[PDB]
Write a protein that binds this ligand. Structure first.
Ligand code: BQ5
Lengths: 169, 462
């Protein structure tokens, strides 16, 4: 069974946690202990191919800025997450991408841009803007709503599809 | 017979337990045989915080550490005062039921409230430093209290209040301080290779231990270090992280600014020796600040440097890196199995607190009624308790005030911004060891003293 090591990156306040938690936690239980091992590993069927997702989310460790390379180095694929109500988190995306390319020593690292919605304030990043940024990088854009679970599967599954397409070559 | 309390009309804590106001986890409290509260209304939580049948130290601690997400300090004080002021049930037909009720309900409950006040003022005094009126109200409530059984606790609370408004030596002998090329007092020559690697590790372990010990639960609960007021609410945690970051960066800088290959090998080798001592001291923050530097993108790519690292030190570095692999699996197992003194890596705790708070609802609903999710808070308090268990035991090492100062005032970035500085480190990496197929240049030596390490074993006995 193939295992995909995925890494979630983004500014603090983005609800990066929520994304990963909503993926892993069962579709109708709101309960989560991050101390156990099932917290970050999920078995899933994507395009008829059963596989194992291992998701690294270091939410809360953003101030350990010199550890980003260490964490990034562990991943084959990356979710770059911003919040649609935080323009600064959107602008920081450029930096995360550059740092990932540098760590993986490659121009063509499997990657997806994710814009997450939760609660107030209202939107400051229109989806068009994010579609344009994603197109300039040549990566997919997925918009998600943590609280309703909309787009969460699509975000992670699209990243796996990106890794498969990269490994063919 | 049960008791016969007042009606809920005249006293809100008499309301019976039901599925709509309090619910429990299936298992029972360790050591104590008390039920574990999963959720309840704030009234029911306060009832159980001050419960008549038994004391609940664990619930009291957990509650006072975590209540502020669901109840403001002013509201808590109002509720415990309300709890204290118990009316007597309707006239005795005049005292069988009244002396019983006074002794087995009123008095126990009143003592439990006083216990809460004591613990609040002793262990969470910051609520009072931040809200002077809250302290005013506590002091005028404590003056209200009249009973002779109460006298001793009232005295004690007043004594704690007074102490709290007011503004290391060893068990046996610490080991002899180690010097290499730099002599004592000559702070101008201090550097990575001139100080003794043992003493670098010891003095960094002392700094990082004090930094770890200063971080309080108030800086962590509610994930406050990630919010816009983080500098206001989590100053000690942030200082601690910035130190760690500074040192990782200083290690990177020492490496890539040593342009001569032989010298750079000596630098990396010396940094691995410091790691070995961190590992001996169980300074896992130290261990990780070295591991982070070595995995950094300017350092990791230096294949020519790594090639010349003696195999023993390669193995040391590889073992340390493996602590971090598979979501800190080996680090976690190692930490569980050692006793103080140590310096944990804080990042794991931060992530676990955040995810606990984010991944669980603030309330649960039952029959249309909103109950505070207390189990969520318990989990956070478990993490802050695990943090606190490594904060009590100091290291048996002498401070060297010059070496200490040297590491406190380290500033590898200087006046530069982060992006600018890390780009400089990376461009320096590219200069000293270009990408294939470009050949390796030579660079002149910068160090006019010997590069040989004194090693990692103490010079003198005991
Ligand atoms: N690619 C060569 C290389 N590998 N590593 C390394 C090995 C194990 C763990 C962490 C880092 C280092 C280099 C240059 C100095 C550090």
């Amino acid at each position: 069974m193939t295992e995909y090591k995925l890494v979630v990156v983004g500014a603090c306040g983005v609800g990066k946690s929520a994304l990963t938690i909503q993926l892993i936690q069962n579709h109708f239980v709101d309960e989560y202990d991050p101390t156990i091992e099932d917290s970050y590993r999920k078995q899933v069927v994507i395009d008829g191919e059963t596989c194992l997702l291992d998701i690294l989310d270091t939410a809360g460790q953003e101030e350990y800025s010199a550890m980003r390379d260490q964490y990034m180095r562990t991943g084959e694929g990356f979710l770059c997450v911003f919040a649609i109500n935080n323009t600064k988190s959107f602008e920081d995306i450029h930096h995360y991408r550059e740092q990932i390319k540098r760590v993986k020593d490659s121009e063509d690292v499997p990657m997806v841009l994710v814009g997450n919605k939760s609660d107030l304030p209202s939107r400051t990043v229109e989806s068009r803007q994010a579609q344009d940024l994603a197109r300039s990088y040549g990566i997919p854009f997925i918009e998600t709503s943590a609280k309703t679970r909309q787009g969460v599967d699509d975000a992670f599954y699209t990243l796996v599809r990106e890794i498969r397409k990269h490994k063919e070559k | 017979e049960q008791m016969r309390l007042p009606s809920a009309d005249v006293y809100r804590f008499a309301e019976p337990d039901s599925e709509e106001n309090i619910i429990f986890e299936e298992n029972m409290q360790p050591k104590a045989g008390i039920p574990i509260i999963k959720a309840g209304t704030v009234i029911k939580l306060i009832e159980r915080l001050t419960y008549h049948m038994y004391a609940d130290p664990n619930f009291v601690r957990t509650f006072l550490t975590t209540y502020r997400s669901f109840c403001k300090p002013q509201e808590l004080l109002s509720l415990i005062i309300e709890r204290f002021e118990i009316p007597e049930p309707e006239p005795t037909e005049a005292s069988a039921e009244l002396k019983r009720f006074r002794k087995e309900y009123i008095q126990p409950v009143q003592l439990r409230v006083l216990n809460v006040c004591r613990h609040w003022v002793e262990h969470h005094f910051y609520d009072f430093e931040r809200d002077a009126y809250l302290l005013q109200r506590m002091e005028e409530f404590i003056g209200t209290v009249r009973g002779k059984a109460m006298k001793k606790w009232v005295e004690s609370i007043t004594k704690i209040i007074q102490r709290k408004k007011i503004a290391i030596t060893f068990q046996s002998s610490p080991p002899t301080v180690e010097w290499h090329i730099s002599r004592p007092g000559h702070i101008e020559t201090f550097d990575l290779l001139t100080l003794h690697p043992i003493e670098i590790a010891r003095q960094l372990t002392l700094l990082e231990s004090d930094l770890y010990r200063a971080v309080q639960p108030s800086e962590l609960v509610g994930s406050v270090w990630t919010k816009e007021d983080k500098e206001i609410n989590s100053p000690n945690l942030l200082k601690m992280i910035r130190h760690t970051t500074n040192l990782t960066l200083w290690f990177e800088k020492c490496i890539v600014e040593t342009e001569n290959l032989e010298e750079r090998v000596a630098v990396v080798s010396r940094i691995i020796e410091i790691l070995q001592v961190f590992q001996e001291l169980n300074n896992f923050n130290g261990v990780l600040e070295v591991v982070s530097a070595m995995n950094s993108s300017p350092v990791y790519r230096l294949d020519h440097t790594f090639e010349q690292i003696p195999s023993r030190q390669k193995k040391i570095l590889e073992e340390a890196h493996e602590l971090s692999e598979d979501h800190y699996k080996k680090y976690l197992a190692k930490l569980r199995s050692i006793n103080p003194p140590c310096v944990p890596f804080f990042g794991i705790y931060l992530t676990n607190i955040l995810k606990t708070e984010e991944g669980n609802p603030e309330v649960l609903k039952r029959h249309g009624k909103e109950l505070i999710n207390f189990s969520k808070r318990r989990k956070v308090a478990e993490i802050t308790g695990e943090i606190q268990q490594y904060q009590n035991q100091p290291y048996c090492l002498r401070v060297e005030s010059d070496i200490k100062r040297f590491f406190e005032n380290l500033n590898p970035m200087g006046n530069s911004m982060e992006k600018e500085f890390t780009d400089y480190l990376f461009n320096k990496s590219l200069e000293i060891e270009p990408r294939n197929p470009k050949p390796l240049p030579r660079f002149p030596k910068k160090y006019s003293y010997p590069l040989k390490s004194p090693g990692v074993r103490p010079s003198n006995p005991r």
